Design an enzyme around this catalytic site. Structure first.
Site, PDB file in Angstrom:
ATOM      1  N   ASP A 177      -3.845   1.806   1.874  1.00 12.32           N
ATOM      2  CA  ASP A 177      -3.468   0.608   1.131  1.00 12.32           C
ATOM      3  C   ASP A 177      -2.458  -0.161   1.975  1.00 12.32           C
ATOM      4  OD1 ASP A 177      -4.886   0.688  -1.546  1.00 12.32           O
ATOM      5  OD2 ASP A 177      -3.806   2.631  -1.777  1.00 12.32           O
ATOM      6  N   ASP A 207      -4.299   6.080  -6.808  1.00 13.72           N
ATOM      7  CA  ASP A 207      -4.151   4.816  -7.536  1.00 13.72           C
ATOM      8  C   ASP A 207      -4.367   5.020  -9.047  1.00 13.72           C
ATOM      9  OD1 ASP A 207      -6.389   1.840  -7.757  1.00 13.72           O
ATOM     10  OD2 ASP A 207      -4.439   2.277  -8.757  1.00 13.72           O
ATOM     11  N   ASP A 242     -10.459   5.688  -9.766  1.00 10.54           N
ATOM     12  CA  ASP A 242     -10.639   6.190  -8.388  1.00 10.54           C
ATOM     13  C   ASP A 242     -10.656   7.722  -8.345  1.00 10.54           C
ATOM     14  OD1 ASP A 242     -10.232   3.450  -8.090  1.00 10.54           O
ATOM     15  OD2 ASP A 242      -8.593   3.626  -6.582  1.00 10.54           O
TER      16      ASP A 242
END
Lengths: 920, 920
Positions: free
Chosen positions: A378, A634, A638
C-alpha cells in the site's frame, strides 16, 4: 470538533518503547529450571490442565487458581467475587514469560534430528570404547584411549551445537509487537502481552481481545464480553465492578480500564490454552528437502564406506581394518550439526529481523519470506511518507450563498477515510472563509448511495437539523464535473481552468477528487477538488531498485487515481518515467467504466481504485501463474485473498488480526524495509549452500581417500592425526555463516518444488572435491621418497588434507558472490589457528623425518589456490541458447505490440466511458 | 526593421577563435604540483569546502573568499557590498584551470588497475630480490642481479605507461566549447568557461547560466537571477549595481554586461561545486568486458603456469625450477599495460576529435559513439549548406488593392522560424512592389490557431492598429490552395499554373509553403508560396556513402514536405534516385491526414513535419528494435526522447542544454563530420583487438613453451636472454595503435551485450600462437646437432622467439584490413631495431657456437611469413548458409511486395485525405 478531541485524548504513544535486548539476557540465564516447587510427572500436569479448566475447587495451599472459574462458569456475577487486585514483582514476569511467554502455545518438535542422529552417534563412540576395553591382550597400545579421546571431541561439538539455541529463546522475551496498551510513560503505551507484565494499566475497547487476565478498574457504561472461547453461551457477559478480562472477546461493547493480574500459564485464557496441547504432525518444505538430502547422505556414505572395507582384502589387510574404515568413513561423512546450524541461523536471523523495526514471528516463515517473488504494498504510510493526505485542496473564488459552504465542506471527501491533518486543513480553510464554525466536523448522515459504475461517483444524502436538503458527491474529476452546475452557472472559464489545474497536479502526482452536491446525484454543483502526492524516501527508492535486481515484483495498492498512481509509480521507480497505460506505472483502475481493468490490474504492479470480493479472485488468479506474495491486510473483504496467499505483512500501527494471517510485521512502516528483509533471506540461503558444499565436497574426498589406501598407497589412517582433521574440519567450519552483499543480484529461489542442494551445487562439490581428492594421490604419490617407509607421505598426507579442506571452506563463502578470500573474519582466524596446529603437528614431534616440508609445502600453496579460482568461475555463471530460441523472440515482436495497442485502444475507451456510450 | 537591427547588434563572432593546442603544453608542464602555499591533510580540505559554502567569515590572511556569501545568504543587497573589480594575470588562469578546469567536478577513479595490478607486480620483483639476497652461499652467480635488472625494465615500462596520460590532461586546458561570451576581437566572442579566464568581458542574457563568478558592469533595467542552486529560496534576486554573477540561473530577466572575477575552485558556483564530491560506483560496458577478460587471463595464466611447474618433476628438475617457471610464466602472461594503453588511445583519440571542429567531452562516450548504428540528423545547417531558407518565393502578377500586400507579406511563413536572409528577400521584395516599408518585419499578433489536422494548416489572427481584419495561413500547398479565393476570383489558369510550378520545384527539392489569408481560415486568398532546396556538400555526400558501408543508418529530420524531403534524400544519397513512398527518401509526414505516418516515419530515415510528445515514443519504439542513436537536440518536446536515447549531438552554434544530455558537439555543423567520427571510433576498436591478439597469442606460446622444456627438451630459460624477449615483446608492441582505412567497411559492433575479445579473435590468437608454439619445438627440435649440449638450440630458441613475436605483432595491424606488412611505421622501426638486438645477441658473444645461423636463419624467414598469410585469411571472412535459409527469402518475395503495395494504397489515401473524406 467533538469528534477528534475524543480521538486525540484516547491515543498517542510515539515510541513503542526503546527497551533493549537486555532483560532477556538476565532472565534467560535461569529459565526452564530452578524454583517451581512441584516436579510431578508430566502426565499429571496435562490432566491438571483439563481438570483445572472449569472443574470444582480443591485446595492447593497456594495463592492463584482464579482463572478456572472463567471457563467453567459465567463468572459474570462472580468476577467481582474472586475480586481484583494484583500486580507482579518483576520476578513473576521473568517466570510467567518462561512458562507462558507468547500467550499462545507453540509446539517445538524434532522431526527426529535429536534421536536418529542425536545420540545414535553417541552410542557408536560408546561401543567403540567397549571394543577397546574388550580387547584384553591386544597389541594395539592405547587405541581404546585415542578413540575415547576423539569421541569426546565429537561430543564437545555435540553439546555445543545443542546449547546456544536454548539460551537464544530466553533472549526473545521482553519484545514489543501488538495487542496490549499500558500506562508507563506520560501516556498510554502499547506493548506485547508477554512483556505486559502484571501491574501495568491496560485499556480494552470495542472489538479488542484481552491480551491477559485483567482486573477491570472502570470506564464506559456497560462492558460486554464474549466468554465463549473459554466457557459457553455466546451471550455477552456484563462485567460488573472490579471486573476481569481473561482473554475473551470484547463484543464492541463499552471501553474499560484495567490492571493485568494474571499473565502466563496461570492465565485465564492462558490456562485454557498454555496447558493442553495433544500433538500432531506437519513440516516445512525446505525441511523436506533437507531431510531428503540427509538420507541421500545417510545411505551414500554408509555404502561407499562399506566398499572401502570389503574391496580392501586386495590391499592385503584383514577385513577388520576395512571394517573400522567404513565405520570411520561413516563418522566423517555423517554431515552432522545441520539441526544446530540452521536453528542458530534461524533464531539469530530472526533476531536481527526483530532488531530492525520489523517484528517477525515463527522461524518457519523465514523460508517462505526468502523466496518472496512479489510484494504488494500500500502507498500511504508504507511507500510514501505522506499518509493519504491531500494538502492541495482548491476551490474557486467565492459566493457565500448558504449551501455554497455546505457543498464545499462536506464533499471534501477523499479516498481512504480515517482522519488525519488533511481534514484539519479543511477545518481552518472554512475559518478563512467567514468565521462561523464546525461545518468540517459534523453533519447528520444516514443514507449512502454506493458508488455505482455509470455516473462514477459516490454520494451521501444528509440532512441538517433545520434545512432544505443536500447531497454531497465524490469521485473521478472528469465525470463528476461533467455534471456540475453550481450557484452561478458553470462558465466555460471556470470549467477549463478547473480541468487544467487537476491535470497539472496529476501529471506529477496529485490524487484528484471531484466534489459537487445535488440530492440524488443528477444535479450539478462543483465545489472543489483535493489532490495529493508524497516524497518517497531513503530506502524505498533504493529498496525498489534492489527488488528488480533481486527479481522480486512489487505491486502498489493505493486510493489514488490511475493518472496519479502511475505518477507515483514513476516517481518511486516502480514504473520509471515512461508513461504507460499498459500496466507499469499506470496499471489499471478497479473501476466500473474501466471494469476491463482486471487485465490492467494484472498489469504487473499498479492498482488504483479497487473493491472487495475481488481480492479473492485476484490472489487465486495471480497464484495460478505461480506468483508468490507478500501482502498487506486491510478489511474483511480482503480476508479470503489473505488466507489464499502465503505471506501477510501487517503494519505495526495496524491491526493484529492481519498480523495473524501473516508471517511478519512492519514497525518501520517503510517499503524499503521489506526489500532489506528479502535481502537477508536470500543471504541466509546462499550461505547455507556454501556451508553444505564445503562440508560435503571436502568430506567426500576423505570418503574415497580412505578407500584408496584400502587398496594401495602404504601409510595409514589413525586416531591421532585423523581425529585432528576431524576436529578442525567437521566442527565450526561446516558451521559458519555470513550475509552476501551481491546476493540481491539473484532471482528468487523456488521452494516447495525446487530441489535442495542444487544439481549445479552437487557439481560444485564434486568438482572441488574430485580435485583435492586426486590432488592428494599425486600430492606426493609421485613426489619422491628414498626408503619407502612413510616419513614424508604421512607428514603431508595429513598436512595437506588439513590445508585443503581449509581451502574448500573458503569456497563456501557467499554462494552468490564469486572470487572472495580472507572474508569471514572469524572463519579466517580459524584458518590461521588451524594451520598452526598443523605446523606444530609437523614441526616438533616429526622434526627429524621432514623432507616434504621444503618443496612439498610450497606446492600446497600453489594449489591451495586453484580451489578459490574454481569457485570464482562457478559463482559467475552464463547461459547459452542455440540461436533459434532468441529468434522466436524476434517474432514475439508485434502481436506484443499489437496486443499492447489493442489493450490501449480499449484502454482508450475506458478514459471516457460515458461520452462513448452517449455517442453510441 | 527594429526587430533585426537589435538582433544583428547583439550577435556575431565568426571564428570560435583560432587558438592553438599550445598554452596547454606550457601550462601542463607545471600542473598538479608546485606553489599553492598550503598542504594540509586532504581531510581538512573537504571539511573546508562544506565549511566555506555559506558559513561565517574567519581570517585566512589571503585575498579571495568571496563566493561563500553567495550560497550562504542572498547576496542581493551585499554583492555591491563585496564589491566588484578583478581580473587575472594569465597566471591565475593556468592555476585555476588545473584546480577548477571545466566548472563541473568530474571523478577519475580506478576500478583497481593501479593497485591490484599496479604495484602488486612491483612487490613480486621486490621479493625476487629478497630471495636473491636471502641465498647466501648459493651457487647461482648473479641471478639476484639479473632478476633485479629485469624487474627494473618491467618498471621502466611501469612508469612510462602511467606518465603520458597525466601530461595529456594538461594539454586539454584552453579549448573552445560553449557557455561564455567575451570581448576580445572587435566583437563579443564565445569561449569556454575554463578558458574564460578572469578579465574578459562576458555577457549574460535571459535564460542563460553564469559560466563563472562575474562582477556585473551594467545593462538592462532589472537583472533577476535564481540563486537556489547555491542558497535557497527560488525567489529571483535583484542584482543591484556592480552585481555578481556566480553561476546561478538568469530567470530570463534582463541582460547584463560583466567581467569575470572568479574562475576556478575559488569560484562562486565553483566553490559549492568543485570542492565537495563524496564518491560512488559506476562503470562502462566495454570496461566490464575488459575487466572480465583480465580475470580470464588472471586465472588462466596463473594456472597453466602452476602446471608447467608441478608436472615437471618428471623432467627431473627440483620443484624449485618449476616454481620459478610458473611465476615466470605468470609475469609474461600478465597482459599488462591495458589501463595505460586504452587511456592513451582514449585521451589522444579524444584530442583529434576536438582537433576537427567537433568538440567531444568524456572519454567514456567514445565507446558508445564507436558503436553508433543510427544517426538522426537535421537537414538545414547540418546536412545541407542552405539553412532552412527559401529563396524562390513566388507570387502572381499584382492587384495592389490594400490587404493584397498584407496577405502576401504576413503569410510568407515557412517551416522553422528564427530569422535568416530568407526573410530579407521578402523585405526587399515588398520594396520592389510599391515603395512603402515594413510590412515584412511587423504586425500585432496575439492569437494563434494551432495547426489542426483536418484543414492542414496553421494560422494566426492578427490586427493592425487601425484596420479591417486579417488572418494569415500557412501549410501544405495542395490543401491550402484548395480554399483560396483572393481579390480577383480564383481563375483556372492561376490555379493550374500555381500547382505545376510547385510540383516543378518540389521534384528536385523545393519546400513549398501555402499562404492565403481569411480571418478564421475558412476564407480563401492565395498570396504565394516560398519553396527551398540546398547543395549537400563535400564530406556529407561521401560521409553518407561511408555510413552505408559501415552499416550506420542515417535519418534526416527536416521542416520540408515529404515530396521535397524525398528529393533531398535522393539528392544527398540517403535515398538514391528511386522515388519511394515506402520510407527511403520519401518516408513519412508527422502529419494529421497522414497520421498513419508513424509507420512511414519509421521508414528507416526520412521524417518531415512531426510534432512534440511523439519524440518520446519514437525513441522508445526505435529502441525496442535495438536501434542505437545519435540525435540532435531542439526543443523541450524532444527532451524525453533525448534522455531515452544514449548519444546527444548538439550544434556548436546551438544550445548548451542539449550538449549536456548528449556526449559530443558539432562545431563543423556538417553531417559528413559524424561519419568521420564513426570511422575513428571503429578504428579505435579493431586496433585494440589486433593489439590484444598479438599480445595474448604470442604470450600464450611462451606459457606452454616454458612447460615443454619443463618436461623435455634440454636447454633452459634464464634471466638474460629471457629478460630481453620480455622487454622487446611485452613493452611498446602490445602498446602500438593505428587507424584502419577500410574499417568503415565493417558493420557496427554490439557493445553491452557483445562479448569482449571475440571468440573468433580467441581463435585468431590460438591459431597464430599454436603455430609458432609448435613451430618452435620443430624449429630445431628436429633440425640436427652433433654434441647434444645446447649451442644451437639456445642460439635459435631465443632468436626465433624474438623474430616470431615480431611476426605476430604484425598480424596485429588493423583488425578490419587483411594482409598488410611494413605498416605502422614506428612499429616497423621497432621491428628492425629489435631484430638488431637479436643479431648482436647471437653474433658476438656466441660467435663461436653458431651452427643454426646458416640454414636455421633462412628457415625463420620462410616461416616468418606464414603468420601474415594466416591473418590475411582471418581478416577476409565469408559466411556459409545451407541453401534452405536463402530459399525462405525466395518466399519473403510477395507479402513484402504485398505489404509495400498496401502501405502505398493507404499511403495513397494520405496524399489527399480531405478529397476522400468529402467523397465518402
Amino acid at each position: 470538533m467533538a469528534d477528534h478531541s475524543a480521538s486525540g485524548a484516547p491515543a498517542l504513544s510515539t515510541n513503542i518503547e526503546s527497551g533493549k535486548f537486555d532483560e532477556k539476557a538476565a532472565e534467560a540465564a535461569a529459565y526452564q529450571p530452578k524454583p517451581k516447587v512441584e516436579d510431578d510427572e508430566d502426565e499429571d500436569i496435562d490432566a491438571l490442565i483439563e481438570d483445572l479448566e472449569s472443574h470444582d475447587g480443591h485446595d492447593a495451599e497456594e495463592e492463584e487458581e482464579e482463572a478456572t472459574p472463567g471457563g467453567g462458569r459465567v463468572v459474570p456475577e462472580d468476577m467481582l467475587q474472586t475480586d481484583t487486585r494484583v500486580g507482579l514483582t518483576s520476578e513473576e514476569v521473568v517466570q510467567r514469560r518462561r512458562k507462558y511467554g507468547l500467550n499462545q502455545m507453540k509446539e517445538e518438535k524434532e522431526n527426529h534430528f535429536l534421536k536418529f542422529l542425536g545420540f545414535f552417534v553417541g552410542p557408536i563412540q560408546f561401543v567403540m570404547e567397549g571394543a577397546a576395553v574388550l580387547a584384553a591382550g591386544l597389541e594395539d597400545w592405547v587405541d581404546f584411549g585415542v578413540i575415547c579421546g576423539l569421541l569426546l571431541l565429537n561430543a564437545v561439538v555435540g553439546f555445543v551445537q545443542e546449547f546456544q539455541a536454548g539460551s537464544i529463546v530466553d533472549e526473545l522475551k521482553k519484545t514489543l509487537a501488538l495487542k496490549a496498551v499500558v500506562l508507563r510513560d506520560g501516556t498510554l503505551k502499547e506493548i506485547e502481552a508477554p512483556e505486559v507484565v502484571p501491574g501495568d494499566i491496560l485499556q480494552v475497547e470495542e472489538g479488542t481481545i484481552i491480551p491477559a487476565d485483567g482486573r477491570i478498574v472502570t470506564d464506559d457504561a456497560f462492558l460486554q464480553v464474549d466468554q465463549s472461547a473459554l466457557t459457553g453461551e455466546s451471550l455477552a457477559v456484563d462485567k460488573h465492578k472490579g471486573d476481569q478480562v481473561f482473554a475473551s472477546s470484547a463484543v464492541k461493547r463499552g471501553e474499560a480500564f484495567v490492571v493485568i493480574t494474571a499473565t502466563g500459564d496461570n492465565t485465564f485464557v492462558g490456562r485454557a490454552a498454555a496447558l493442553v496441547n495433544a500433538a500432531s504432525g506437519g513440516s516445512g518444505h525446505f525441511t523436506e528437502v533437507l531431510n531428503g538430502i540427509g538420507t541421500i547422505l545417510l545411505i551414500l556414505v554408509i555404502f561407499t564406506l562399506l566398499i572401502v572395507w570389503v574391496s580392501s582384502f586386495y590391499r592385503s589387510n584383514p577385513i577388520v581394518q576395512i571394517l573400522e574404515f567404513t565405520l570411520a568413513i561413516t563418522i566423517i561423512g555423517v554431515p552432522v550439526g545441520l539441526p544446530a546450524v540452521v536453528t542458530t541461523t534461524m533464531a539469530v536471523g530472526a533476531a536481527y529481523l526483530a532488531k530492525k523495526k520489523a517484528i517477525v514471528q515463527k522461524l518457519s516463515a523465514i523460508e517462505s519470506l526468502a523466496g518472496v517473488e512479489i510484494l504488494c504494498s500500500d502507498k500511504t504510510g508504507t511507500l510514501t511518507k505522506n499518509k493519504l493526505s491531500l494538502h492541495d485542496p482548491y476551490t474557486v473564488a467565492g459566493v457565500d450563498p448558504e449551501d455554497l459552504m455546505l457543498t464545499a465542506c462536506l464533499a471534501a471527501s477523499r479516498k481512504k477515510k480515517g482522519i488525519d491533518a488533511i481534514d484539519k486543513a479543511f477545518l481552518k480553510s472554512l475559518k478563512y472563509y467567514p468565521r462561523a464554525k464546525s461545518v468540517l466536523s459534523k453533519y447528520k448522515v444516514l443514507q449512502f448511495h454506493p458508488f455505482d459504475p455509470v455516473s462514477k461517483k459516490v454520494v451521501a444524502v444528509v440532512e441538517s437539523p433545520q434545512g432544505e436538503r443536500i447531497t454531497c458527491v465524490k469521485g473521478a474529476p472528469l465525470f463528476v464535473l461533467k455534471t456540475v452546475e453550481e450557484d452561478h452557472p458553470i462558465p466555460e472559464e471556470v470549467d477549463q481552468a478547473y480541468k487544467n489545474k487537476v491535470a497539472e497536479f496529476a501529471t506529477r502526482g496529485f490524487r484528484s477528487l471531484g466534489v459537487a452536491r445535488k440530492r440524488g446525484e443528477g444535479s450539478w454543483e462543483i465545489l472543489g477538488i483535493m489532490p495529493c502526492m508524497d516524497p518517497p524516501r531513503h530506502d524505498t527508492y533504493k529498496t525498489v531498485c534492489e527488488a528488480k535486481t533481486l527479481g522480486l515484483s512489487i505491486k502498489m495498492l493505493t486510493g489514488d487515481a490511475v493518472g496519479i498512481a502511475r505518477e507515483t509509480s514513476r516517481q518511486l521507480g516502480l514504473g520509471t518515467n515512461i508513461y504507460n497505460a499498459e500496466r507499469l506505472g499506470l496499471g489499471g483502475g478497479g473501476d466500473m467504466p474501466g471494469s476491463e481493468v482486471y487485465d490492467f490490474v494484472e498489469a504487473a504492479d499498479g492498482f488504483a481504485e479497487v473493491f472487495p470480493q475481488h481480492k479473492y479472485n485476484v490472489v487465486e488468479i495471480l497464484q495460478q501463474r505461480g506468483y508468490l506474495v507478500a501482502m498487506t491486510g486491510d478489511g474483511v473483504n480482503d480476508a479470503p485473498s489473505l488466507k489464499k496467499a502465503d505471506t501477510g505483512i501487517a503494519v505495526e500501527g495496524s491491526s493484529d488480526a492481519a498480523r495473524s494471517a501473516a508471517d511478519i510485521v512492519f514497525l518501520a512502516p517503510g517499503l524499503g524495509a521489506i526489500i532489506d528483509a528479502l535481502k537477508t533471506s536470500r543471504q541466509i540461503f546462499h550461505r547455507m549452500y556454501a556451508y553444505v558444499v564445503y562440508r560435503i565436497a571436502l568430506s567426500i574426498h576423505l570418503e574415497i581417500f580412505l578407500g584408496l589406501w584400502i587398496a594401495i598407497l602404504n601409510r595409514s589412517l589413525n586416531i591421532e592425526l585423523v581425529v585432528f582433521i576431524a576436529i578442525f574440519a567437521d566442527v565450526a567450519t561446516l558451521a559458519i555463516a555470513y550475509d552476501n552483499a551481491p546476493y540481491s543480484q539473484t532471482p528468487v529461489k523456488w521452494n516447495l518444488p525446487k530441489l535442495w542442494g542444487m544439481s549445479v551445487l552437487l557439481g560444485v562439490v564434486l568438482a572441488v572435491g574430485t580435485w583435492i581428492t586426486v590432488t592428494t594421490m599425486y600430492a606426493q604419490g609421485e613426489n619422491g621418497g628414498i626408503v619407502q617407509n612413510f616419513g614424508n607421505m604421512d607428514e603431508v598426507l595429513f598436512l595437506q588434507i588439513s590445508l585443503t579442506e581449509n581451502w574448500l571452506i573458503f569456497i563456501t563463502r557467499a554462494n552468490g558472490p564469486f572470487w572472495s578470500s580472507i572474508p569471514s573474519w572469524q572463519l579466517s582466524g580459524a584458518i590461521f589457528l588451524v594451520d598452526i596446529l598443523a605446523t606444530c603437528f609437523t614441526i616438533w614431534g616429526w622434526f627429524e623425518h621432514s623432507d616434504t616440508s621444503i618443496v612439498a609445502v610450497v606446492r600446497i600453496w600453489i594449489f591451495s589456490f586453484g580451489i578459490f579460482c574454481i569457485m570464482g568461475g562457478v559463482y559467475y555463471i552464463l547461459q547459452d541458447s542455440v540461436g533459434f530460441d532468441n529468434l522466436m523472440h524476434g517474432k514475439s515482436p508485434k502481436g506484443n505490440q499489437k496486443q499492447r495497442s489493442l489493450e490501449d485502444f480499449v484502454v482508450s475507451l475506458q478514459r471516457v466511458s460515458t461520452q462513448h456510450e452517449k455517442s453510441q
